[PDB]
Design a binder for this molecule. Structure first.
Ligand SMILES: *[C@@]1(O[C@@H]2[C@@H](O)[C@@H](O)O[C@H](CO)[C@@H]2O)O[C@H](CO)[C@@H](O[C@@H]2O[C@@H](C)[C@@H](O)[C@@H](O)[C@@H]2O)[C@H](O[C@@H]2O[C@H](CO)[C@H](O)[C@H](O)[C@H]2O)[C@H]1NC(C)=O
Ligand SMILES: CC(=O)N[C@H]1[C@H](O[C@@H]2[C@@H](O)[C@@H](O)O[C@H](CO)[C@@H]2O)O[C@H](CO)[C@@H](O[C@@H]2O[C@@H](C)[C@@H](O)[C@@H](O)[C@@H]2O)[C@@H]1O[C@@H]1O[C@H](CO)[C@H](O)[C@H](O)[C@H]1O
Ligand SMILES: CC(=O)N[C@H]1[C@H](O[C@@H]2[C@@H](O)[C@H](O)O[C@H](CO)[C@@H]2O)O[C@H](CO)[C@@H](O[C@@H]2O[C@@H](C)[C@@H](O)[C@@H](O)[C@@H]2O)[C@@H]1O[C@@H]1O[C@H](CO)[C@H](O)[C@H](O)[C@H]1O
Ligand SMILES: CC(=O)N[C@@H]1[C@@H](O[C@@H]2O[C@H](CO)[C@H](O)[C@H](O)[C@H]2O)[C@H](O[C@@H]2O[C@@H](C)[C@@H](O)[C@@H](O)[C@@H]2O)[C@@H](CO)O[C@H]1O
Ligand SMILES: [Ca+2]
Ligand SMILES: [Ca+2]
Ligand SMILES: [Ca+2]
Ligand SMILES: [Ca+2]
Ligand SMILES: [Ca+2]
Ligand SMILES: [Ca+2]
Ligand SMILES: [Ca+2]
Ligand SMILES: [Ca+2]
Lengths: 114, 114, 114, 114
């Protein structure tokens, strides 16, 4: 299945944060309605925050996360959870190699804000 | 039910990060095996990171998140998700008031690291 | 926090299924827009299905699960998961006593159907 | 990423239940520590239960779900959630065609029982 794609309510502010855990530099692209809205780049094997920003889901509500390491697309896994019928958290793990920890870049998207 | 309490594998590094979305200053306490291991304090209505740290689950593996606003405990909601049978993300939402967005402080615990 | 309440898309068929794991007879009430739409009753300590039905979310979309044992409300925990950005599963655990396994009645709500 | 694979605590009873939502007959295989422990077969477009059984995770704790339709592997998505730090629900969605509802067979694994 396609992974890393989430439908948000239209015109809604959301947070996106990425963490790195890999010897390789991670490039995390955040596409909102098929346009790049943010790109986080960084290298850490200690869960450093490599980007954290507030974006707007726009008219189409489509948010997609892509992760690559020196031009090679990482394998993604993702899900969305809703807590108290209100707090939405979408999650993306990514694997740049063969050990399958899926933590090489970890991306958290949350809404609503404020 | 009790919320914000999670059992981790023993002696495992984990990340804990908190975001704020409230006019009130949030205090997030992280207890590892019933002792305070970190405290984050901060204010944002725009999902700012108010703390992000690497901790160790220790012998007992017990992690508890408590959130308060000027000494009053916030109500919590929480869940843990596992992706690719390996990537663990424990989530806490908290509510300091009456609107029930549960985003006043949002806490993300993730493991494994590295 | 309130638990066992979920917003579904309006006028959408959904499945609701309950499993029992308790010496006590479980009563599971499914409220759709604040009116009882189904009630399951049954006893098992082996995860037997005590009810499974298809319902319609109606105009309001509001689905609430309540669990009781001979008139006494069990304590509930819940969350909703979305997989492949399309498959929705809402989950309710319940505790009728003191051991906090939260499995005494387990309720699964899923959509879309068909 | 591989989907439909879950690590359970060793020697623990768990439930596995499958629902069908497709014009095609679904075959769900449950492998426990790499050996076939159950197979459910059925056809429904109305979320009927096509199998529900209690199994034991054995020494290794490895549970894998495979879904096929007339010999062809369906595409899977999955996740595990833990509620109240104790109730575990692993979920599998599957797609046998092109509409990507991922509900064609839906599999719920839960523990602990009793
Ligand atoms: C691996 O190196 C390979 C090279 O061996 C070669 O195959 O060329 C490829 C590029 O095509 C790689 O450069 O690179 C991985 C990152 O791309 C790296 O794994 C990642 O970082 C690790 C620290 C860890 O976080 C892992 O999850 C990440 O995917 C891998 O590092 C090694 O991973 C091992 C487990 O398989 C083990 O942890 C080693 O400690 C760690 O160094 C890396 N392997 C090597 C040998 O360089
Ligand atoms: C000794 C006993 O039967 N305990 C069960 C409990 O009984 C009380 C009874 O002692 C008296 O106080 O009246 C109460 C109602 O007013 C109640 O009947 O009833 C519990 C549920 O109502 C029951 O626990 C449930 O069933 C279990 C088998 C298990 O699935 C539990 O998770 C579930 O909540 C008590 O059963 C015992 O529970 C303990 C754990 O606390 C062990 O599982 C024992 O083996 C059970 O017999
Ligand atoms: C037209 C179509 O897509 N038909 C069903 C499809 O039939 C295939 C047949 O056209 C082709 O030549 O042979 C292949 C096997 O080699 C199929 O037999 O088969 C799939 C299941 O294999 C059906 O889709 C399933 O059942 C549906 C009712 C629904 O639950 C869907 O999610 C599921 O995957 C196809 O059924 C059609 O699906 C469409 C949506 O794509 C609508 O739901 C139609 O009403 C339905 O008939
Ligand atoms: C009247 C007042 O001072 N209310 C404070 C809350 O702020 C208002 O919340 C309401 C919603 O209830 C609404 O958003 C207003 O615009 C706010 O001024 C405040 O709530 C907390 O901060 C909010 C900005 C919002 O994030 C909310 O979810 C959060 O709980 C609480 C905090 O203690 O104080 C109230 O006195
Ligand atoms: Ca890796
Ligand atoms: Ca890694
Ligand atoms: Ca609030
Ligand atoms: Ca808020
Ligand atoms: Ca119980
Ligand atoms: Ca029980
Ligand atoms: Ca389908
Ligand atoms: Ca279908």
């Amino acid at each position: 299945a396609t992974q890393g794609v989430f439908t948000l309510p239209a015109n809604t502010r959301f947070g996106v944060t990425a963490f790195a855990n890999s010897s390789a530099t991670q490039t995390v692209k955040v596409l909102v309605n098929n346009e790049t809205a943010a790109t986080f780049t960084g290298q850490s094997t200690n869960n450093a925050v490599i980007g954290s920003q507030v974006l707007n889901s726009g008219g189409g509500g489509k948010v997609q996360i892509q992760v690559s390491v020196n031009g090679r697309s990482s394998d993604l896994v993702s899900a969305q959870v809703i807590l108290a019928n209100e707090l939405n958290v979408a999650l993306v793990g990514s694997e740049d190699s063969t050990d399958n920890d899926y933590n090489d870049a970890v991306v958290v998207i949350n809404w609503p804000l404020g």
